[PDB]
């Protein structure tokens, strides 16, 4: 049932690399990003319909287009989805991470766009059916045990709209659009602005700069603006043993 996205999508110009970037810094390594058909896999899930046409995230499809366009230029294999329930979501995820596609891919990026709740000290995520799940559940899916195919591979999990301790993640980045705000640009949401700025920054710098630099640029950018510049800055991410640089080397292979 896995259908890689195919089709022409117009969007900003994404500068291309002219070499395989390796930081040159030398001290920290670089995730391999040089294959020509297995550069990366993107799992994009944009949920935009809930119990009633009230919380309907209008303008969300605009994000799907930006992300798809951007990752097509990064030469990723893309698996995009619309509204799905808690049960469908976890089935898709498993199907994707267990896919022959991911088995040989050099990089994995998932972007889940939905509504998020902060029940107690826990963080939850909503789906089409209105149901919720501990984001922890979602992250845990990427433990080496469950994702054999991603061990030692760059994993970027993005949620733009946010003696008995179980194992931890490695080579993983968890990105958020950290803002207790939702209305922005008179007709948008903070996550959508985060996403747009992200794609813009990716488009202009992916050819030259590693992901973590881009995320800081994204966070600085989305921050310096209106209706969300109170406690200073907005974007944020967790580095879970993501100890090497991640250059996407768009448009170039070795």
CA distance 111 to 208: 22
Would you call 188 helix, strand, or coil by DSSP?
strand
Instruction: Give 28-254's CATH code, choosing from 3.40.250.10, 3.20.20.140, 3.40.50.1460, 3.40.50.620.
Output: 3.40.50.1460
- The dihedral region occupied by 49, where left means phi > 0, alpha psi between -120 and 50, and beta the remainder, is beta
CA distances from 209 to 23, 34, 190, 217, 245 (A): 9, 15, 24, 10, 9
DSSP 120: T
Q: Is residue 31 within 8 Å of residue 244, measured between CB atoms?
A: yes
Q: Is residue 102 within 8 Å of residue 96, measured between CB atoms?
A: yes
* CA 240 to chain centroid: 15
Query: Which structural technique was applied?
Result: X-ray
- The dihedral region occupied by 106, where left means phi > 0, alpha psi between -120 and 50, and beta the remainder, is alpha
């Amino acid at each position: 049932a896995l259908t890689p996205y195919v089709g022409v999508v117009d969007g900003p110009e994404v500068k291309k690399s002219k070499k395989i970037h390796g930081g040159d810094s030398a001290i920290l390594g670089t995730y391999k990003m040089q294959s020509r058909f297995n550069r990366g896999v993107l799992l994009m899930v944009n949920i935009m319909d809930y119990p009633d046409q009230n919380r309907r995230r209008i303008g969300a499809e605009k994000d799907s287009k930006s992300l798809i366009h951007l990752f097509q230029e990064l030469n990723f294999t893309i698996f995009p989805y619309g509204n799905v329930n808690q049960d469908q979501f976890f089935k898709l995820l498993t199907m994707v991470t267990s896919s022959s596609y991911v088995q040989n891919t050099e990089c994995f990026v998932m972007v889940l766009m939905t509504h998020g709740n902060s029940v107690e000290g826990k963080e939850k995520v909503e789906f089409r059916d209105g149901s919720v799940v501990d984001m922890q559940k979602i992250k845990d899916h990427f433990q080496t045990a469950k994702c054999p195919y991603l061990v030692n591979k760059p994993k970027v999990l993005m949620f733009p709209f946010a003696s008995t301790n179980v194992p931890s993640l490695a080579d993983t980045l968890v990105c958020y659009a950290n803002t207790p705000g939702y209305v922005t640009h008179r007709d948008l949401d903070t996550g959508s602005w985060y996403i747009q700025k992200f794609c813009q920054v990716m488009a202009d710098h992916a050819h030259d700069t590693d992901l973590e630099d881009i995320l800081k640029k994204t966070s600085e950018a989305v921050g310096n603006k209106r209706t969300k510049k109170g406690s200073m800055q907005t974007g944020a991410y967790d580095n879970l043993g993501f100890n090497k640089k991640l250059y996407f080397n768009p448009g170039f292979f070795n």
